[PDB]
Structures are given as structure tokens and as C-alpha cells.
């Protein structure tokens, strides 16, 4: 049932469109939205997994649940204000649980044919990679990160005009930097990353071990401006500690749909094209949509105020398909197209395999354990991430380790046992890759059969809606690059696997549960991404645009909901939310979310890893 | 003059548009035609420089000429029985001239911060490629290129059903090839070269190697099918003998604007949208053009037929515009849409930089001389192709050595001062790259200010219109390269240059001087192309669609006539001109151009080689 009329309609239940929905319900006393959403769930590219294992261990029909993230899968206390303000309005914050990013340096490192952990790049002034690749001189002997870490100290120095003086450095200072430092007289955002380590005289052989070794080669090798590059490459320094729901992000969106109402959420409904009825001064909304049958349906409705929470490639659809766009003036609609090629589509993938047990492990390898965060490769799997069966344990020992206490033996034992018992539970591996590597796996995923364990249905109850399975050929090349990854021989096949490819599609060949926007977005060379946004709040009069795209912080669902505030500030009246939460607060919602985990994971600790602890 | 109706409108003066104008005049008595091109020149693709530079030599107002080449440069007198055909028909065969590949080994190559020759790459088993890669020891002691024709005989082997007899293996053999052979039971026009290779065992070491070493990474890192990629990377075999034109391949365009009459061309036209006019069944031509003064104009006009001889890109903007196309049902629009998607775009670059005199002799370096061919690099660079000028003897000298003939000490001693000479005469080096590379070169040209040699008006008394100069940080960049590849200090300043990147724009903000397409095109992953060429021959009554896209022979003019010619037949009557000329002639068009040209040479040897030659 799509109502007659609305007085705002939003296009995307994305986290842009959803989040519009709830602060204009909240605290505009709007009643008269509804969501419109092409595809069959809410959530958009966070996309997270809960999948029930037959527990099929010897003294155990019981079940074990194994979180797996499609899309995002982490954030921060810091530097993410809307995000936090956001998490503590709606009372997610005791779901919080560690992000770990290392494994004491047992992670793997594959380049160049060879097989080697963290720790042992490190060894004899980090000669390996002075022996993998063909290095000048002045390359040699440092820490790869490190050479994008002093890059970025130069290109401070040389620009004393910009104050780089604030500890937390957020969308603003990204901003200014991108915009107003500059190399050699020409500001960062006309610059390439790879023109701009070239210029400065850096080897290619050592732009390639950058590139590789920093796992996403799109800010090297896209269309990408090197401004927003470092954005992105500066924002996983060796001592993050990143966080997660238990959950999944997804805990987030759905979230979301509770507070609004699934009444006023319409799946399968996509918006097609936009025009203006100047008679009663309202958009009117052409749709097509999909019953629950396979019923096929198109059909028409006004809003007053129209919300397209969308990101590039969508909303050139809907511009090229819209009277609304049309009838505008020549030289204005191509501002305005020109306007959205502003931003560079990012492809991304993630490719998960489930395991009934975990084998990078001590037991299976005979090497030390593996335990969290990228495993990174200039295979085609560009990174890989382990994922283990949820167990409050296991978070508990997590909390305890992003506290940089000293165990006594006693505690340092328990650790050491709960390190070793989540390989014996199911597991699952992201293979996690973006621009240069994600056309590997596509035509990969494409060809031939899909992969399915025989009896699957015995091993996995009920298979979740948005699982589609890796193809057989994705699973058996996944399967060589990580025997070459984690150095072994043994690597049994996956109980179950899902494959994803964020690539934005323009062939009307493809089922809707298999059309996937642009993984991320990043501005372009030459884009004045101030300009651009504040272009984007309201492109014509009541029609507005807003999501991750186009934002102050791409990448990220901060940034979603920062361009969409502007939605919020210049169309309905509402402040930041950060600000609106430090109003009626009394302090930030970074220092609350701080405060509440602090007390959520000291008595994780105390009741699980130490009774005793501080 | 923009007549108000014609019988046949073509949109596009490239070859395709030139080359149906001028065998519908001549074959089939259509004189009420015109030609339509956005640009201010004809030709497209194809798009020679005839520079006259300054004799600044000591004995010397007189002039030396330097041909370069934007654009395509070579052909061959197999496989291209329609451009044969047609070099005959519009007499141009004594304009052939040799168009080498290779030094005799002393070409350079450049990988992994390393440089050296084709012939040190030859020494001790190929020792080289083994030590700069972490190769597979199948993968070792044997030459890259022959990696490539030994995986081709292996498909050629399991695939017996497929008759692989054919000593001339043109664009018939190269369609059954992908779309009939199989590896592991899915045809070859359903893989990626990629995927294709690493399922057979191959190191990414080696996989790396190869799309290093071959030039061309886009036939594996694309989108485009291993069968097509196959027919490009088995196109310069070791004993190739390419030629080209004297004055370059414009010489081709221009000589049929010629026969065609400049004016039926309607330069700076360019066809925005086309509509039917049910009433008169006839299509309407809405265009905008710009006279010599900028004075924009917009219009219309009517034609019986429609002749567009335009690439993907191209063909998806009228799409989008066009009544005639939107006017069509939902699900033939489509599947039309969906049909234009089936090629992939393939972007190109050549940068062109001319010197006073060449600097990669043995007089200049102290290395063994560099003469003709790629020499290829994993820098950005990808291939570097010299250039030099004009000069006759050259040629004959060139002529000689295309024989396998064992000149005495007399008339080894001439060859060998007539190959020094040439570097102390202008010359010019193209950089000339695909995929990957272009990012690096794009956002370099478009940064910062042009190069322009001081004084250059005194070096080059008129500079062609086409020349767009090379940014100065283009020329820094490629100047070091170039001491990497060629191993010396010594890289002097241009005396002019030109960047040219063949990559398709959707940006309303760039001149007309500087929009151009995609470089060339080659089949995606699981197109049919069998059914989609004829699907496009005439994909609407009376409108037709033709050109190197969406053709049999990607990346040549052969296609581009290929693909016309199939219009031609079905739109006119006309068969294909490869076998009219061998009907007019009594034999094919490829012995004809092979005798005309072995009589040319043969008079060019004696007269300036070697007096008493065979
Ligand atoms: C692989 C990956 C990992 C990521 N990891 C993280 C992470 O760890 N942390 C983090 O903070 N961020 C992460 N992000 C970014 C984060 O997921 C996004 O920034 C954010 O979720 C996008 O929200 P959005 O509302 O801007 O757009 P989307 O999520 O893309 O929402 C747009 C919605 O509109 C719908 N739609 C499109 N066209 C139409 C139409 N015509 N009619 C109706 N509906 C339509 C789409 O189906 C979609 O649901 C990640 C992104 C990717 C791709
Ligand atoms: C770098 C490079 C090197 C190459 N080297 C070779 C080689 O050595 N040998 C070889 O055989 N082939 C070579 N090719 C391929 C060859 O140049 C092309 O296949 C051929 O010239 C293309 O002809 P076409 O008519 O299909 O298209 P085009 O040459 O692209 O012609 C299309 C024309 O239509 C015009 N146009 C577009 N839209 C409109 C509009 N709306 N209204 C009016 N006009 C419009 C364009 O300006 C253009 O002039 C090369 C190609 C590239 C990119
Ligand atoms: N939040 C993203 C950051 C990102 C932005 C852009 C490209 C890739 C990644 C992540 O965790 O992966
Ligand atoms: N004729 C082209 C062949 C080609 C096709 C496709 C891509 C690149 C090159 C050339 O000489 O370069």
C-alpha cells in the first residue's frame, strides 16, 4: 500500500535514508514520510550476517552463531560524533565489542611469491621488503607505512598556513587539508597520490609496495585525488582500536527500522524517475513495484519534499529518467551532472568463507596462531580478515588486551587458553579487495557453478535471504591464495560462503537481489568537494540529496550522516546531532561513549578474564 | 549549409563514416548524402602529424619533415583484406613504407627498477625474467612472449572439434576461436585471461611478468574476455612485418575526403538526438553546430537512412536522447541497452615528444643503438616507440632489411652509416600505454601549465591544430623514464610535444578540442558478439549502426570497415569490397598489395641500397 501523497518522500533505506526518517519523526514532528526502497531489505551497504551453525562438537540440537559482515563492519569513538551521538540515542552502546586490527605481529604477509608475518618484516631493519622489492637508497631500511606516515609530516611542514594543531582530526581538518595544502604550488586535491609520491622521487618499484601493502591500491591507482587519499590511508594507524556490534553493523539499521515502523518502509519499490506538478507546487514519484508474488507494478505519487539518500550512480539514473532534471535549463543541468562526476565510484568486495573450525591456527599450522585483522597480499585477495563464533569470553579477553595491562601468569594463562579455544569453534575468513583486484573476482564469480558443501542443510538451519554463494571457481582459487597466505598445506573446504561485489551495475540483465551500488566513493582530481557538497544539499527547490557519496568523510557512515544533516539543517530546521546531543547532554557523545564502555568492558573484564583487575 | 533532407545522413566523420560515404557514391549512386562530425576534423582515430622543423643543421630557409602519429599507425598486408582492397582502389600502395619492430635485440626493456636489452634478456636461459620474478620453476629458462603461444597451443589442443587449419587466421578464425574453444568446459568468451591463466597453475609472479612485459596490461587487469584478449596478444609475433604510410595513416582519411568532397562533411556538427517522423517515414537529426566564428546554432533535419559509424560511448549518449529509442518498448530498449554494453571500453594514450635530433644512438649513449620498435617497461611509460624523419633512403634501407638477404661488406657498411645517420635528423618518442597506466598520465597532463620549448616558434614554423602540448609535468616525468629505460643521463628537452588520452568523457566542461573516445574496444566476459554484431547492423528500420566497437577486428581500421561493410550488404546491396575487388581484379587483394608493394621495394633497394640487388 504507497500512499496518494506524502509531505516527504524518502528515496534509499540506506543508513541516509533511514536515519533522515528517524530524526525528522523525532524531532521535527513529521508523521508523513515513507521509505522507499528498491531492493528487498533495508540497511544498504551495511549488510551484516548472523548465521546458526549446527554445533556438530562431540559433547553438544544446539547452535553456535558466527557474525560475518557483507559491507561495513567497524568504527570509532573518536573523530565519528554523529555516529556515537547516534549509537547512544538509541541505546546500542552495550552491544559494543572490540575491533582487534593485529595479531602480536603473527599476522601473514604475502608479496612477491613469499610467505612472512609482521614480526618477520621487522627483522634486520626491515630488509625483506629491500629484498622483495627494488628499492633506492633512501627506501630502504623503514617500515612501508612509515614512508606514507613522513609524507604526510612533509606535506604539513611545507604548509605552515594550515594549522595542523587539533588532536582529533575530522572531516573538517580532512577537508582543509585536501583544499588547502599544497605540493610544488598545486593543492592536494588537483593531485594524484602516484603523480605526487613520483614527483617527490620515489621509485615505482617502491609505489608498488606501497600500493600493495596498504591493501586498498585505489588510492594509488583510481581517479581518486591524493587529498582524500591520505584521508583514507591515515586513518588505520598502528594503535587503533576500532570497534564493532556483536551483532554485525547491521544491529545499527535495524535499529532504525524499529523506531520508524516498517509501515512506512516500502521494499522493492524503486524510484524511477521525478518530475514537478507546478499546479499544486509537488513532486510527483514514478515507481515500479514488486509484490510479494512477482506481481509487477508501476504507478505515481507527490510529496511536497523529496529526500534522495543515494549515492552517484543511482542518482544519475534517476537525473538522466527525470522531467524534473530535463526541464531544467541547459547550462544549469549540465552544472548539475557535471556537479555528480564529481566524486569517483570506488568498487569494493567482500567474499566470505565459512569453516566449521578455524585452521590459521598454532594446532593446524605449525606456525604462530593468527589470530585478528588484515592479512594482507598482492594476490588477489588484497586482504583478509578472520572472523570467529561469537562467545562473551573471547570479548571479554579482547576488551582486556585494548587495555595495555600487564597479566600476571595466572592471567596471562586464561588468555593464553581462550586465545587457542575460539579454533575450535566455527570461523569464518572476508576476503576484502578493492579497484585493481576486484575485476579477478568478478569474472571469477560468474563462471560456472555455485559452491555449495554437500549437506549443507544439515550444517546451517536457515541460510539468511541475502547470501548469494560463491561461485566453485571463486572457492578454489580463494582456497590456493590462502594455503600461499598462511603458508600450509591444509585448507579444508568452506561449510558455506557468500560473495558480494560492490560494483555498480547499469544492465537491466540482472536480478534486483543481485544490483549493488559502489562499494565507497572518493573525490576526484580537481573537485572542490566544499563547492561540490553544499551544490548537493538542495539541487532544486525541495529536492534533496544526501548520503555517503558526496560526503565530509567517504568511506564511512559518518559521512552518511553528516551530508545528511545538511539535508536535516537546511530543509527542516534541525542542528548536527552531535550538537543536539551535547545540548541536552552536557558533554560530547565522544566522552559519553568512552565513559559507557569504559564501565561496559571493566566488568566484561572483571567477570570474565580477572576478578581482580583494576 | 546544412541541407533540410537527405537520403542518407552518417553521423561520424571517422573511417567508418568516410568509407560508407565513399562506396555509397561510387558503388551504389547515392549522391544525396552527408557526413556529420562533432569535431573540427575528419578521420577520428586515425590522426597523423606532419611536422616542419626549423634545419638548424651547420650546411644548411629549409625545412626537415617529422611524421608522428596520434592515432593509429600500422597495418598489415594479411588478415586486412578490405583496408588491401582499399589502399588499392584509392591507389595509395606506393605510399607503403616498412614500420619495424625491433633493434636487432637492442631494444630496451625496463622492469623492477631494472634496465636492460631484449638480447641480455635472451642470455643464460633467460636468466633475467628468473631473477626479477619469484617464478614457478615451470615458469623459468623460457622467453615471456613464448608463455603466451605455448598456453594458445595448449587450448588450440583440447579443443579438436575446432578446425585450427587456416594459414591466414583472420577475423573468422579469431570469432569461432572464443566463442567455440572451451578450457575446463566454459568457452573462452566467458573468461578473463586472468582467471584463465591462474586456473591453469600460473604464479601471479608470472601472471605480472606477462602483463608487464607485453605492453598492453588491459587484456588482462580489464574487463574484455581472454578469447578476444588472445586475438590481440597473438598479433605481433616475433616476424611480424608491419607497414605504414609515408606521411602516416591520415593519408588514408584524407584521400577518400577527397573523393568524397568536403562538402558533403559537415565539420563541428555534432548529432544530439534523432527522432522518427511517422507521418513521412523518415528519421529528424537534431544537431548543434558551431561556424568558424564560435557562433553556436542549433537545428534539425530530416534523412531516409541513418548511418551511425560511432563507438559505444557515442552510441549510449544519442541513445539516452533519442526519441527514437525511447519512444521503443520497455523491454526491447533494454535489451538494446544491454547489447551496447557488451563491449568493453578500452582506454588509450600516446604522448609524442619531438627532438631536435634522437639521443638513443650509440653516439649519445654509448650503448647499443636503439632504432624501431616498442621497448617496453612496467613504468608507466608501457611502450616507447621512436620515431624519425622523413627521409627516403631510410626507407630503402628499412625495404632491404625487410628481406632476409645477406648483404656483402659494401652493402653492409652503407646500411650501417645510413641507420647512424638517422639520429642526427629530428625525431620524436611516443609513450604510448593502456589500463593502468592511463590514471598516472591523465591527471599529470591535466596539472599545472603547458610545456612549451622557449623560442619554439623558430623551431616549427606551423604547429598542426590537432597538437594539443603536453603538460610540463608530463615532460618531467616521461623525460626521466626515459633515463631509466634507455640507461643514460642524458634526456634533453623536446622541441615540441603532444599528449593525447583516447579515454571517453561525460564532463559537459571540456572543449570540443579535447573530447575524444575510448583509445579502442574489445568483447566482455560472456558477450556472444556473433549475435550481437548482427543485432546491430540495423538495430532499428532504415537506421544502422557500424565501426571498430562493436566490430570482428577490434583495434584496427579492419574492423571499422568490417563492420561498415555489413551495413552496406543489408542497408544497400552492397557485398563486402574484399571480394568486389577480387571480382573486378582476378585475384585477392592481399596478392595484389603484396606484388605492388614487392616491385616498389624492389626499385627502392636497387635505386638507393644496393645497385646489383636481386
Ligand atoms: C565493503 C564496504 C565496507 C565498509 N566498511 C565500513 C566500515 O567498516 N565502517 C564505516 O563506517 N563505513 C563502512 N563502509 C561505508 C558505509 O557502509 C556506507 O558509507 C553507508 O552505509 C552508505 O549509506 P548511504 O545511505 O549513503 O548509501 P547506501 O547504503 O548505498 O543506501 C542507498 C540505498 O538506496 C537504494 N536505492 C538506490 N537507488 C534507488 C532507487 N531508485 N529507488 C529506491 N531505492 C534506491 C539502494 O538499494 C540502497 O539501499 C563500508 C562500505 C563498503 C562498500
Ligand atoms: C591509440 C590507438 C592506436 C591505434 N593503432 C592502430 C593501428 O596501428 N592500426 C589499426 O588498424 N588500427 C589502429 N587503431 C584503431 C583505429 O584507429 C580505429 O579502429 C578506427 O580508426 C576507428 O574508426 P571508427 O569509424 O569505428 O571510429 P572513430 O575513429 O572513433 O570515428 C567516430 C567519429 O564520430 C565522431 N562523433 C562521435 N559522436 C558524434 C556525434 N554525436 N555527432 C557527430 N560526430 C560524432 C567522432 O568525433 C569521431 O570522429 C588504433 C586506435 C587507437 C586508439
Ligand atoms: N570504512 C571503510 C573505509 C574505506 C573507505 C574507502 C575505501 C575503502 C575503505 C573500511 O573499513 O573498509
Ligand atoms: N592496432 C592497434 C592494436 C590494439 C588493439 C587494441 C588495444 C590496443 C592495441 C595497435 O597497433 O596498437
Not at 281 to 288: A, F, Q, W
Request: hydrophobic share 40%; charged share 20%; glycine share 8%.
Amino acid at each position: 500500500s504507497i500512499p496518494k501523497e506524502v509531505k516527504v518522500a524518502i528515496v534509499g533505506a540506506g543508513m541516509s535514508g533511514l536515519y533522515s526518517a528517524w530524526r525528522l519523526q523525532s524531532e521535527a514532528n513529521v508523521g508523513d514520510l515513507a521509505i522507499f526502497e528498491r531492493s528487498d531489505r533495508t540497511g544498504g551497504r551495511l549488510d551484516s550476517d548472523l548465521i546458526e551453525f549446527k554445533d556438530n562438537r562431540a559433547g553438544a540440537g544446539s547452535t553456535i552463531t558466527v557474525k560475518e559482515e557483507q559491507g561495513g563492519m567497524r568504527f570509532l569513538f573518536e573523530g565519528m560524533d554523529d555516529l556515537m551521538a547516534l549509537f547512544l540515542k538509541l541505546g546500542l552502546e552495550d552491544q559494543i565489542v572490540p575491533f582487534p586490527m593485529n595479531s602480536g605481529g603473527n599476522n601473514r604477509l604475502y608479496f612477491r611469491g613469499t610467505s612472512f608475518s609482521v614480526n618477520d618484516a621487522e627483522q634486520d631493519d626491515y630488509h625483506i621488503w629491500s629484498a622483495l622489492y627494488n628499492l633506492d637508497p633512501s627506501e630502504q631500511g623503514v617500515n612501508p607505512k612509515d614512508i606514507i606516515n613522513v609524507v604526510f609530516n612533509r606535506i604539513l611542514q611545507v604548509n605552515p598556513q594550515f594549522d595542523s594543531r587539533p588532536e582529533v582530526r575530522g572531516p573538517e581538518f580532512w577537508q582543509n587539508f585536501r583544499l588547502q595544502c599544497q605540493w610544488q604550488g598545486e593543492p592536494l586535491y588537483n593531485w594524484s597520490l602516484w603523480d605526487l609520491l613520483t614527483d617527490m622521487g620515489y621509485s615505482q618499484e617502491c609505489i608498488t609496495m606501497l600500493y600493495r601493502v596498504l591493501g586498498f591500491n585505489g588510492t594509488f591507482l583510481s581517479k581518486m585525488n591524493a587529498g582524500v587519499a591520505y584521508q583514507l590511508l591515515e586513518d588505520f594507524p598502528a594503535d587503533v582500536e576500532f570497534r564493532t556490534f556483536k551483532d554485525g553493523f547491521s544491529t545499527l539499521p535495524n535499529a532504525l527500522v524499529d523506531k520508524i515502523g516498517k509501515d512506512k518502509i516500502h521494499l522493492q519499490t524503486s524510484i524511477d524517475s521525478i518530475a514537478f506538478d507546478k499546479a499544486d507546487s509537488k513532486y510527483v514519484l514514478k515507481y515500479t513495484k514488486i509484490d510479494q508474488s512477482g506481481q509487477v507494478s508501476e504507478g505515481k505519487f507527490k510529496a511536497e519534499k523529496v529526500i534522495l539518500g543515494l549515492p552517484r550512480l543511482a542518482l544519475e539514473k534517476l537525473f538522466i529518467a527525470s522531467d524534473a532534471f530535463k526541464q531544467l535549463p541547459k547550462k544549469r543541468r549540465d552544472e548539475l551532472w557535471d556537479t555528480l562526476q564529481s566524486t569517483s565510484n570506488q568498487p569494493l568486495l567482500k567474499i566470505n568463507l565459512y569453516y566449521d573450525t578455524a585452521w590459521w591456527g598454532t594446532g593446524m599450522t605449525g606456525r604462530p596462531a593468527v589470530s585478528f585483522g588484515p592479512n594482507f597480499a598482492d594476490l588477489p585477495t588484497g586482504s583478509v580478515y578472520p572472523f570467529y563464533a561469537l562467545n562473551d569470553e573471547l570479548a571479554a579477553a579482547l576488551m582486556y588486551d585494548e587495555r595495555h595491562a600487564t597479566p600476571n601468569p595466572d592471567t596471562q594463562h586464561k588468555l593464553d587458553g581462550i586465545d587457542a579455544a575460539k579454533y575450535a569453534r566455527p570461523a569464518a575468513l572476508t576476503i576484502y579487495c578493492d579497484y585493481l583486484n576486484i575485476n579477478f573476482w568478478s569474472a571469477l564469480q560468474n563462471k560456472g557453478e555455485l559452491y555449495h558443501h554437500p549437506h549443507e542443510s544439515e550444517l546451517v538451519e536457515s541460510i539468511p535471504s541475502d547470501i548469494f554463494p560463491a561461485s566453485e571457481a571463486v572457492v578454489q582459487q580463494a582456497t590456493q591464495f590462502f594455503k600461499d597466505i598462511f603458508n600450509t598445506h591444509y585448507v579444508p573446504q568452506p561449510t558455506l560462503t557468500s560473495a558480494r561485489i560492490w560494483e555498480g551495475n547499469v544492465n537491466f540483465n540482472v536480478p534486483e537481489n543481485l544490483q549493488f551500488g559502489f562499494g565507497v566513493h572518493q573525490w576526484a582530481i580537481g573537485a572542490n568537494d566544499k563547492e561540490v557538497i553544499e551544490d548537493l544539499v538542495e539541487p532544486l527547490p525541495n529536492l534533496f540529496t544526501c548520503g555517503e557519496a558526496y560526503s565530509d568523510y567517504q568511506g564511512w557512515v559518518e559521512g552518511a550522516l553528516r551530508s545528511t544533516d545538511l539535508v536535516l539543517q537546511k530543509g527542516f530546521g534541525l542542528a548536527p546531532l552531535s550538537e543536539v546531543y551535547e545540548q541536552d547532554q552536557g558533554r560530547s557523545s565522544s566522552e559519553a561513549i568512552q565513559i559507557a564502555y569504559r564501565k561496559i568492558s571493566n566488568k566484561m573484564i572483571m567477570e570474565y578474564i580477572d576478578p581482580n583487575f583494576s
